[PDB]
Symmetry: D2
Subunit: 224 residues, 4 copies
């Protein structure tokens, strides 16, 4: 009865925005390579206009007919609003967004909440508009530590964004990537980052596709 083998994931006629690639070693770059091989149409954002020349180079290792590169510093509203606006005109609606997340002072603390947590709120608020039929949003992470408070804040934000956007048929999820010193020592190996990239890419493919339908508000831990 069945004459052909089915594919678990296939992203042809799907468009995704991939944010926060800096270099060949970025976790998002491995997500790109994976989504590219699944035949997705990819759009890329970058913070500093001083690194557009690098993304262009990276995009060569990719099978992408036309290159869509946008400068968006997400700390700036106008760049996130305008940025996503352009995307809407250039490539139409999208299917999802991959977002790569980057006693102490008040400013130190609120800045980490801005950079590591609210960034997901504003991305989601603007990208919402290019997802009239539903879509999927993935966020990835890789005296006391405000970094730990910032991450806890984001995890919570994934949860509430999920309930919030659930009615719009928009799923929001997160990936957590990464004598316990032995493990930090390992993570230092080129081979190891390489392995991290493909594994997060594979897991993001699951979350960004219909393969993970019915899955929202979740935080999947990707390790080794």
């Amino acid at each position: 009865n069945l004459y052909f083998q089915g594919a678990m994931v296939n992203l042809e006629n799907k468009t995704y925005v991939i944010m926060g690639i800096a270099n060949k070693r970025s976790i998002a770059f491995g997500v790109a390579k994976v989504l590219d091989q699944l035949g997705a149409k990819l759009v890329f954002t970058y913070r500093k206009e001083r690194s557009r020349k690098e993304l262009e180079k990276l995009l060569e290792q990719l099978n992408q007919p036309e290159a869509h590169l946008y400068q968006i510093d997400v700390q700036s509203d106008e760049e996130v609003i305008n940025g996503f606006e352009q995307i809407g005109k250039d490539v139409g609606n999208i299917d999802g967004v991959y977002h790569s997340i980057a006693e102490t002072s008040r400013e130190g603390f609120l800045l980490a909440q801005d950079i590591s947590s609210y960034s997901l709120t504003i991305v989601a608020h603007e990208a919402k508009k290019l997802m009239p039929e539903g879509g999927s949003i993935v966020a990835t992470t890789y005296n006391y530590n405000v970094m730990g408070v910032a991450k806890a804040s984001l995890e919570a934000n994934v949860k509430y964004l999920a309930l919030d956007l659930g009615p719009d048929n928009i799923r929001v999820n997160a990936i957590s990537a990464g004598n316990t010193i032995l493990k930090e020592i390992e993570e230092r190996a080129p081979l190891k980052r390489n392995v991290d990239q493909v594994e997060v890419g594979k897991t993001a493919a699951y979350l960004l596709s219909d393969l993970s339908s019915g899955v929202t508000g979740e935080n999947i831990h990707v390790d080794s």
Copy 2:
């Protein structure tokens, strides 16, 4: 590691699927999904009734050779020998989808009181310990490693099954721990919620009331992700679908 996508399916993989009792069984959504992805499937069952329903359900699948094994998970003998025999017939496997038919838990429940010792231990036996002994015997068939997936699925006063479930979820995380050095991932799937006139109008349209929705295919898809190499860096996790 080299992804090489496009070729992303379960051709050449073999899984043991437990917990099918009929067309509506959630484990049947899993079976259909894996079947369409190219996997070879081995099925377990406790009751004859369930074996005949399986023989019928295989009609709608694309398994050349049918593989049905009677295993009552409450019997060590039947788990050990069942799995031994699976290895003889089919060789090494890639994973197990662990589940208990919804029928088993409702009949062997109206027997004991929610509060009874016997009731409590029986829920713990079938719902949690079954996974431990299943993993221990299936492990013998996954020498290069593999993937095990356990699913999670009427209260009067005391919800004894709620406790069996929590027990199972912890069982999963500790198996994940114990089995990592053997390259065997262990994960769970649960029903998801967290992890006025228009409602009435919605009901009027369905010609029916709206209740607990768990979609068999949505479970099969997540199961396939968890049983596949897609999820290579994922263990001791609990994924909520709904």
Copy 3:
């Protein structure tokens, strides 16, 4: 290991009184009756006068009032320094923000998001850094959140998650200094369709009712006192068990 357990000869700074219905006022009555010396903070002159009327129902032989806006690094540092000079070392701080002050800038706005982070979570951090200085022999810091019930985006829900994480990291940080940090999650307090969910939580919660300010005060007394000397980094739900129905 002695007979009496009460708050005699203990001194606590209480934050978060706006009016007679503030959870913090419930805490104050409880602590007062147990014998503690209370120092009160406020920001607005409104809440300064209000505290003056409310102190007249307690048994403080003295009103200790300090103006401390938690949004100001200067006021927190100087305020706690004055307290130190006026009253000496303290045994703890009750930290909360009055529900009244939460007076509804856009839910999804960057400012909105960060103001909640600033008010609900960071205020604990700086309060703890300055109060630490008055607790050289250790002490107890309690942080309370209130389910203040909601268009689409639960921005305060994020802020709460932040506070809770903050409690735990402070408890880890301040532990060697012998200073305990804990949180209280107060259920809804009856204090018309907005809050017809006091009826939902009620009938659904295990204890089949709502809690009140005084019940929160009882748990705060426990956390501030030596009865909980081995307890830090916790989060106690004073909510008729509603938390458990998940």
Copy 4:
């Protein structure tokens, strides 16, 4: 900008309020074996706060011990019942007799036992069905049977506390199965809280000991070897103090909770 003025005191309180007072309360205390028992610390504490105390024991050696420890408490009346929780009839009869002797109680304190067995010596995936289910029966079901009988003595409501002490008994290769029995207990606490809430019976747990957590690893061996001095001594009193909070009106509105009592 501050204020520091006098308020008249003529209408103030004349006495010292007590945070916890247990004078008209009766508690059943389970789990005392010797002077080092966590439950003996709870006893000391509840006694010093005026509670009427009843004690259950399993072994005879513990009965002798209880008679010796009672002379350190201020209980005009001794009341000792043999109750083995592994037995339905013993739990049912025991609380029956307690009811006949002292009438209604205000709560129960239950030390959670963890049985040592053969399965503790091996890997978790090798755990026998019997070993697994024994851990479940002892460490988790125990709380169900006790709540079931004790609630018969709490018509107007009460408070139930279960305590797990993570000490040397956990320094085994197969702490995993104890982990699973513990996880089962935490959930039992919550589902009992749900079940008994409508009866105004609160159910809570305390976790204590030199081991921080069993979550998912012989870091556990080091936590044991590196115990603080007098670790069980401080825990005895600090658990007792927390138990007093949970067993009394001081913790009203609080149910389904697990409070971690760790002085580190």
